[PDB]
Amino acid sequence: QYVRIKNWGSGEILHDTLHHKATSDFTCKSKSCLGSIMNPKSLTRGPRDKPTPLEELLPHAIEFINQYYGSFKEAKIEEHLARLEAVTKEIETTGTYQLTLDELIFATKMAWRNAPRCIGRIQWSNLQVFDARNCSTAQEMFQHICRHILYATNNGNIRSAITVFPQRSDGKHDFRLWNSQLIRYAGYQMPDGTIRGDAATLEFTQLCIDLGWKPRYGRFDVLPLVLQADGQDPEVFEIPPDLVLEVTMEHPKYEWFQELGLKWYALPAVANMLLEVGGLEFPACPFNGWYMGTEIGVRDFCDTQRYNILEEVGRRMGLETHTLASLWKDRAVTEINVAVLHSFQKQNVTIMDHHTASESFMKHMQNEYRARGGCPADWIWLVPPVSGSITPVFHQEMLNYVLSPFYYYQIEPWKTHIWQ
Amino acid sequence: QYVRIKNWGSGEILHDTLHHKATSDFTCKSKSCLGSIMNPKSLTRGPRDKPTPLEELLPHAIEFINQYYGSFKEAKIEEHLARLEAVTKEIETTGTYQLTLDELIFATKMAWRNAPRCIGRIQWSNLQVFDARNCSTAQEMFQHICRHILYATNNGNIRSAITVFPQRSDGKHDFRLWNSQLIRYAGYQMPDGTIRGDAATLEFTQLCIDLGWKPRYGRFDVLPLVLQADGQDPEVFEIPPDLVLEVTMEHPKYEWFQELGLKWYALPAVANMLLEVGGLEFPACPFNGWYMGTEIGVRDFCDTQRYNILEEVGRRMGLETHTLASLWKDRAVTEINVAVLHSFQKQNVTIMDHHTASESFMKHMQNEYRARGGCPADWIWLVPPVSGSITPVFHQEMLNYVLSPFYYYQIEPWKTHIWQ
Numbered sequence: 001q002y003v004r005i006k007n008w009g010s011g012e013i014l015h016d017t018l019h020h021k022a023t024s025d026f027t028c029k030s031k032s033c034l035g036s037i038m039n040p041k042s043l044t045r046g047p048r049d050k051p052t053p054l055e056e057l058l059p060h061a062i063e064f065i066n067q068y069y070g071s072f073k074e075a076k077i078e079e080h081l082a083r084l085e086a087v088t089k090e091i092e093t094t095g096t097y098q099l100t101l102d103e104l105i106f107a108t109k110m111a112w113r114n115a116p117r118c119i120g121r122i123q124w125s126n127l128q129v130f131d132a133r134n135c136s137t138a139q140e141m142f143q144h145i146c147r148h149i150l151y152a153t154n155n156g157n158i159r160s161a162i163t164v165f166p167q168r169s170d171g172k173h174d175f176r177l178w179n180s181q182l183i184r185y186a187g188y189q190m191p192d193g194t195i196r197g198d199a200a201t202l203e204f205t206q207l208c209i210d211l212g213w214k215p216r217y218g219r220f221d222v223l224p225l226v227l228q229a230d231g232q233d234p235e236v237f238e239i240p241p242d243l244v245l246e247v248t249m250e251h252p253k254y255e256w257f258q259e260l261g262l263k264w265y266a267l268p269a270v271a272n273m274l275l276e277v278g279g280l281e282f283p284a285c286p287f288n289g290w291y292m293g294t295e296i297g298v299r300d301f302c303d304t305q306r307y308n309i310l311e312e313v314g315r316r317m318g319l320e321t322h323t324l325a326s327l328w329k330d331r332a333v334t335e336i337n338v339a340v341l342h343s344f345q346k347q348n349v350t351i352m353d354h355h356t357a358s359e360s361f362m363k364h365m366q367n368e369y370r371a372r373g374g375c376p377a378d379w380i381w382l383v384p385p386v387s388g389s390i391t392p393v394f395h396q397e398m399l400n401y402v403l404s405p406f407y408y409y410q411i412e413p414w415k416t417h418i419w420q
Numbered sequence: 421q422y423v424r425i426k427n428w429g430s431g432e433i434l435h436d437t438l439h440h441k442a443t444s445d446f447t448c449k450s451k452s453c454l455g456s457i458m459n460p461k462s463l464t465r466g467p468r469d470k471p472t473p474l475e476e477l478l479p480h481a482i483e484f485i486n487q488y489y490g491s492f493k494e495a496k497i498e499e500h501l502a503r504l505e506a507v508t509k510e511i512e513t514t515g516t517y518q519l520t521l522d523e524l525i526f527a528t529k530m531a532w533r534n535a536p537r538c539i540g541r542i543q544w545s546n547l548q549v550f551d552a553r554n555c556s557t558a559q560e561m562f563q564h565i566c567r568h569i570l571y572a573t574n575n576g577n578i579r580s581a582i583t584v585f586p587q588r589s590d591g592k593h594d595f596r597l598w599n600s601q602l603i604r605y606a607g608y609q610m611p612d613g614t615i616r617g618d619a620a621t622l623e624f625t626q627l628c629i630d631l632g633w634k635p636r637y638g639r640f641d642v643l644p645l646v647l648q649a650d651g652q653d654p655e656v657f658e659i660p661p662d663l664v665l666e667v668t669m670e671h672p673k674y675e676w677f678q679e680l681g682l683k684w685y686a687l688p689a690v691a692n693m694l695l696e697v698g699g700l701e702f703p704a705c706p707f708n709g710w711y712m713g714t715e716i717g718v719r720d721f722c723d724t725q726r727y728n729i730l731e732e733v734g735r736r737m738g739l740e741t742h743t744l745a746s747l748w749k750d751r752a753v754t755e756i757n758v759a760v761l762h763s764f765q766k767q768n769v770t771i772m773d774h775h776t777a778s779e780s781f782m783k784h785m786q787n788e789y790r791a792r793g794g795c796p797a798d799w800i801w802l803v804p805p806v807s808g809s810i811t812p813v814f815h816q817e818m819l820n821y822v823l824s825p826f827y828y829y830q831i832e833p834w835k836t837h838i839w840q
């Protein structure tokens with residue numbers, strides 16, 4: 001009927017009626033490249049009630065196994081056949097099937113390798129996999145998560161890793177982390193009308209409060225891990241402060257910068273994503289990489305929907321804040337960016353600047369193209385929020401497409417969960 | 421078979437074989453959002469041999485006329501009917517038809533209003549139209565172009581305008597400007613292996629040289645207007661230097677900046693685009709707006725494929741050029757940007773900074789959505805090459821789609837022209 005278009009800044013929504021009057025075929029699509037959309041139904045893998053139908057599951061499984069065994073330099077045909085046989089049988093026996101460890105590993109790397117929105121993909125071969133498939137309780141999830149957060153952090157020398165929880169069974173016994181990302185500050189709507197902390201985590205914070213969380217009312221309060229096992233409702237577990245490594249922000253020239261009382265966690269771990277592989281899907285499998293400066297300096301600190309520090313950092317620099325054309329914003333942000341990179345380097349916490357990051361991705365694309373003849377890339381995401389064309393990936397044409405295995409988005413669990 | 425992907429920086433080309441292994445349907449498209457592609461066959465309107473078939477032309481014409489007359493606040497039904505009648509008749513009489521002046525005007529504004537890649541669209545109602553449809557010689561084109569360039573420039577107080585040449589007849593009597601844009605510097609590949617001027621205009625410069633152009637071998641040599649009328653071959657006309665208004669670059673603090681010997685033309689006029697409207701198509705109709713700082717400061721001056729000044733402007737600032745992570749690039753560019761904005765403001769030449777530009781577009785989108793229920797927007801193009809997320813349009817979801825009337829791209833005339 002119409003398309004819902006949201007402006008992530010004002011949160012305002014618009015209804016596009018015009019697209020119906022489109023000509024014929026546009027680029028690969030007919031009447032609209034909705035590539036600009038954040039959460040398209042196409043990048044999401046929702047709920048269930050019934051298991052994955054055998055006729056579908058079987059081929060998908062066979063496909064994935066052909067991918068796996070076709071991988072190794074010198075194919076183990078017998079084992080390839082043997083595995084195909086063993087899987088077909090196991091599928092027609094249980095209704096689902098289990099992956100060998102080396103399969104999940106290969107899976108997870110390929111899924112990452114197939115994530116069109118990730119720029120750190122040149123690191124695809126170096127990934128740690130925590131097999132939590134045999135897990136069964138919320139408490140057990142928590143213990144696994146802590147181990148991950150521990151291993152990942154490694155005292156600043158951040159390590160990429162993913163902890164895969166139990167796969168999907170029927171569709172009502174799902175393990176799901178309700179948080180956006182492993183570590184994430186809270187946002188509270190204060191009495192005097194203002195907002196404190198991360199305004200993005202406002203709705204989620206209230207949820208934590210509703211599940212009886214102790215609101216510490218601050219600017220950098222690490223939110224609690226909201227876990228749900230095998231269908232069972234979400235149990236709230238607080239992350240051990242000793243596990244949350246942070247970096248306090250300080251500029252190499254502007255000493256008044258640390259007076260801002262800014263800091264940010266060192267661990268970027270995406271929590272709420274689903275892993276599809278060979279017909280199987282793991283709705284709980286948090287992964288982490290390492291920060292890329294611009295994420296914190298530009299997005300986290302300078303967005304209106306986030307901490308929104310730009311006005312202040314601009315003022316303390318003595319810039320013409322009431323004159324857009326003075327490019328004070330361009331000046332401030334860059335300094336905030338240097339602050340972050342500096343503060344991370346100083347406190348020996350792994351981080352990469354967007355330029356070095358883009359240059360390594362371009363190299364990756366070449367390796368990827370020469371290797372498998374392609375590389376799914378979402379330009380909109382791959383190009384940094386600042387210094388776009390000063391970066392190589394801006395002048396690079398890309399093809400955005402969904403392969404498999406793949407890391408899909410999911411429906412926020414609190415909207416579709418049946419309470420008990 | 422495969423898709424050609426070019427990297428506009430190195431000019432290197434890649435062949436994507438992988439997309440064939442795509443899942444099902446992606447966003448609006450099945451196996452690929454090629455929204456990142458520069459010149460998709462979908463945004464191009466190529467050659468011909470035979471006129472526009474009556475069965476197609478007629479409906480399209482009827483459609484456009486329903487759009488036009490449905491426009492005015494209080495419809496002139498009788499004239500609406502009368503015009504529909506007069507057009508149908510005129511079409512079935514000649515094989516093509518002519519638009520009333522007020523129709524071309526309305527057309528041109530709507531076409532602009534429908535350009536998904538333009539950010540200056542809030543100015544759609546203020547546009548000047550030069551009716552050169554009765555033109556017939558290369559020399560006459562030239563005179564019309566000069567008048568345009570004159571009116572547009574207006575001594576720095578730049579005015580948006582478009583000069584529409586003769587529509588398409590059969591498909592072998594086309595009026596086409598071979599230049600990229602009205603005013604544009606030349607690029608020569610010098611003896612010592614280097615490149616001087618705009619490296620982007622290397623192939624076109626050689627063409628001008630082949631058509632006997634006097635190579636002034638410099639960094640800012642305004643290229644000659646290569647015109648072609650009614651099929652006839654391209655006649656080379658040089659633009660009267662008194663018409664080309666330029667702005668010499670100078671920084672408000674760094675006095676060594678003007679020592680760079682930099683400057684740029686004040687007139688942004690797109691030359692090589694085709695105008696489709698009601699089945700009719702005008703392969704020659706140069707239009708112009710006014711510069712948006714970032715175009716010159718970031719694209720023209722800092723691209724590797726262009727003037728490539730970043731290394732130098734960085735060095736003279738005394739920055740750690742051999743250390744990507746020092747964000748010297750971010751620092752330099754911003755200063756170059758201030759230089760441009762400053763130099764234009766100082767010499768009283770209309771220009772707009774990207775922030776003020778984004779804020780006016782967002783306003784436009786709201787006006788557009790409330791008015792007609794939509795606004796074709798190409799995020800990739802609308803978001804500035806620097807300070808992406810510091811701009812409102814970055815956090816704005818858009819729908820990219822081809823409506824009508826519309827400004828399509830064309831095939832570079834020297835590839836498809838039959839010489840005589």
Ligand code: HEM
Nearest residue numbers: 112115117118119120123160161162287288289290292407
């Ligand atoms: C080695 C370090 C890595 C770097 C520098 C890196 C960097 C990035 C960046 C900058 C983004 C965009 C984040 C945003 O704007 O929200 C991103 C997204 C993403 N990355 Fe990575 N990444 C790394 C490792 C990983 C790993 C190890 C995985 C998974 C195994 C991964 C999976 C993804 C996915 C699926 C997204 C999409 C996020 C979303 O859709 O919200 N990344 N990455």
Ligand code: HEM
Nearest residue numbers: 532535537538539540543580581582707708709710712827
């Ligand atoms: C009022 C001032 C205007 C401003 C500030 C403006 C600005 C812009 C900018 C920044 C671009 C991108 C240029 C590039 O990156 O190559 C653009 C593209 C475009 N604009 Fe405008 N514009 C203005 C007026 C116009 C007018 C008057 C027309 C036509 C009647 C127009 C038609 C278009 C079209 C078709 C494109 C696409 C260019 C391409 O595909 O290469 N613009 N505009």
Ligand SMILES: C[C@H](O)[C@H](O)[C@H]1CNc2nc(N)[nH]c(=O)c2N1
Nearest residue numbers: 036037038380381814815816817
């Ligand atoms: C509306 C628009 O798609 C959205 O704001 C985008 C654009 N590009 C992005 N790219 C990255 N890396 N991260 C993001 O959140 C976004 N958001």
Ligand SMILES: C[C@H](O)[C@H](O)[C@H]1CNc2nc(N)[nH]c(=O)c2N1
Nearest residue numbers: 394395396397456457458800801
């Ligand atoms: C490959 C990529 O599509 C290309 O470099 C783009 C991106 N966005 C752009 N946007 C604008 N305004 N101008 C451009 O030339 C480009 N080029």
